[PDB]
């Protein structure tokens, strides 16, 4: 949306001068957003996973992909094929539409918001963030929902380092400390 | 073991049957496969019987 | 008493004992007790010759045992006829060929090392010899 | 003591026609369990991975392949 | 890798066509071009080749690298190999799904006298 051309018109020029880039497109860019939540206790009951899937489809207008256990582990008593959690990945336009409304309404609605930590990068330039609450998004009316299941936001950028990854997210007015 | 014997009797009217095995505990319904009937020299349906 | 734990199989073939040994030089210490004979050398003789060595020096130096039995030996009981299975494993032996360096220690004067190895060489069936480190 | 004493009949595997041998069509070249020798030019492969001739000629063993695998072929000589 | 995953995606069909000892019509596709060439059953030497990079074909084409371009090269390959005596070939996908320009490349070559 507006964030996309804002990136084209401002962020590219902001980062080109800062890091002394020689080519136009060597500046990093975000390529996808991955949303999930592993309900886990859906081992006992099935209707929780269908409820979580309805939440993710409300937060982002896509049907979540149900994910199943990769290997049987006796610690939590699960086996291969058991659906454990959902997953949604956003690319292109729908990525920006969710991204713009994450940084502008959802995060400011966090109860006792103090600031998102800037040391959450995975060592290559990608950002991961928990939310602990699915009510901060306006698409939840607090009455349909029953549980307090949290999401897991992942920012997959093409940055070669977290030093560049921090700068790219900062140029989008990301609430770091 | 638990797998017993059945025969798929042809539907072309002639007396011809392929004999196989089928587990009944999991599936109690009949079997329908299009097989070859050498009496009439055509591929016809073979409904389970016996 | 040296003995492998968690062996793949309980009982093992008798086999034979031919050729010369591989570890024929001192690699950890500076004085070594080297075999000249041939024959299986059980785990009870390994410990009986180690005690006679950590007692001759009794305070100084490190001692390395360069052998480990890892060979089960089965013995038939008494008043039992032949056949009807294989014997039940009794002890463990370390097959020794000439040139194998059995024990070796560093940190003591050569005279004390020479005499200490003589006290252990009287507890091992095979004919051993004293060897010192080289350069290569 | 006891609880043993079991075995199975030997399956008589191994190469039947060695390299340089003149074979007919359909004659078994090697009986195997896995695929130790892979079928090359003019030889087939059974359901039990038996390699058989498909045209009369002289057997040839070769080690073609990225993974250096033994191949069996036939020269119609 | 995006090409290596395709190469191993077309190996099984490509090695069977060699064990079969049949002439094959390999097809290479590019977002800007499309190529085709008839390779002998040996596999090492080619007999006939026609592609969009050829200037004799591209000048009549509005934009080489679309379905209408793939139809023109397919006709070119078939007519070029028709006077050489090659009539019986086997199509090789080269890993591309037989759905777009490769389908038109084959269909136009098929209609132009080639039998496969």
């Amino acid at each position: 949306a507006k964030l996309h051309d804002y990136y084209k018109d401002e962020v590219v020029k902001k980062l080109m001068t800062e890091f002394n880039y020689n080519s136009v497109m060597q500046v990093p860019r975000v390529e996808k957003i991955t949303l999930n939540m592993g309900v886990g206790e859906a081992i006992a009951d099935k209707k929780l996973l269908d409820n979580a899937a309805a939440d993710l489809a409300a937060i982002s207008g896509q049907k979540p992909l149900i994910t199943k256990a990769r290997k049987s582990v006796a610690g939590f008593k699960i086996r291969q094929g058991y659906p454990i959690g959902c997953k949604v990945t956003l690319r292109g336009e729908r990525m920006w539409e969710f991204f713009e409304r994450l940084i502008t309404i959802a995060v400011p609605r966090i109860r006792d918001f103090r600031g998102l930590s800037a040391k959450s990068f995975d060592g290559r330039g990608n950002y991961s963030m928990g939310v602990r609450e699915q009510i901060i998004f306006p698409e939840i009316d607090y009455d349909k929902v029953d549980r307090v299941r949290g999401l897991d936001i992942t920012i997959t950028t093409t940055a070669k380092s977290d030093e560049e990854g921090r700068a790219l997210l900062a140029a989008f007015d990301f609430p770091f400390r | 073991g638990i797998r017993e014997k059945i025969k798929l009797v042809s539907s072309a009217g002639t007396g011809h049957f392929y004999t196989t095995t089928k587990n009944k505990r999991t599936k109690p319904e009949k079997l329908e496969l299009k097989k070859f009937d050498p009496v009439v020299r055509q591929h016809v349906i073979y409904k389970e019987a016996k | 008493m040296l003995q492998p734990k968690r062996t793949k199989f309980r009982k093992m073939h008798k086999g034979r004992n031919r050729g010369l040994a591989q570890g024929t030089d001192v690699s950890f210490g500076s004085f070594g007790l080297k075999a000249v004979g041939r024959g299986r050398l059980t785990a009870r003789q390994i410990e009986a010759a180690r005690r006679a060595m950590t007692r001759a020096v009794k305070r100084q130096g490190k001692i390395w045992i360069r052998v480990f039995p890892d060979k089960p030996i089965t013995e038939k009981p008494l008043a039992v006829r032949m056949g009807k299975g294989k014997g039940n494993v009794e002890y463990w032996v370390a097959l020794i060929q000439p040139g194998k360096v059995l024990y070796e220690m560093d940190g003591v004067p050569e005279e004390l090392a020479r005499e200490a190895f003589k006290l252990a060489a009287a507890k091992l069936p095979i004919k051993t010899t004293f060897v010192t480190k080289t350069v290569m | 003591s006891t609880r043993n004493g079991r075995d199975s009949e030997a399956k008589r595997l191994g190469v039947k026609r060695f390299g340089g041998e003149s074979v007919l069509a359909g004659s078994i070249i090697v009986r195997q369990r896995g695929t130790k020798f892979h079928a090359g030019a003019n030889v087939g492969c059974g359901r039990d991975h038996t390699l058989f001739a498909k045209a009369d000629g002289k057997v040839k063993f070769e080690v073609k392949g990225p993974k250096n695998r033994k191949f069996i072929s036939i020269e119609a000589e | 890798d995006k090409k290596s995953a395709r190469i191993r995606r077309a190996t099984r069909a490509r090695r069977k066509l060699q064990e079969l000892g049949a002439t094959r019509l390999v097809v290479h596709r590019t977002p800007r071009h499309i190529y085709a060439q008839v390779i002998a059953p040996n596999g090492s030497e080619v007999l006939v080749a026609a592609s969009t990079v050829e200037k004799a074909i591209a000048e009549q084409l509005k934009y080489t690298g679309n379905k209408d371009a793939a139809a023109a090269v397919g006709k070119a390959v078939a007519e070029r190999a028709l006077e050489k005596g090659i009539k019986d070939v086997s199509f090789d996908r080269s890993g591309f799904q037989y759905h777009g320009r490769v389908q038109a490349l084959a269909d136009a070559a098929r209609e132009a006298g080639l039998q496969f």
Binding site: A1, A57, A58, G61, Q62, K63, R94, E97, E100, R101, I103, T104, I105, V107, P108, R109, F113, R114, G115, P138, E139, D173, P175 | - | - | - | -
Partner: protein, 66 residues
Amino acid sequence: MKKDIHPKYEEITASCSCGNVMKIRSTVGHDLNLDVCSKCHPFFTGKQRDVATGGRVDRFNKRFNI
């Protein structure tokens, strides 16, 4: 998109009490009115106004009216 297996996704008008009228695409079905957005959220000026819990010595000193 896989042809009507997804919820409806349209454009809504989300506005704040202090303005912040920003058009967005969401799946609610009706326009939404909320608090101050990230533009006017006091996460960058009320820091001293946020850490103020306590105060006992001065409170007693007020009661020291003699």
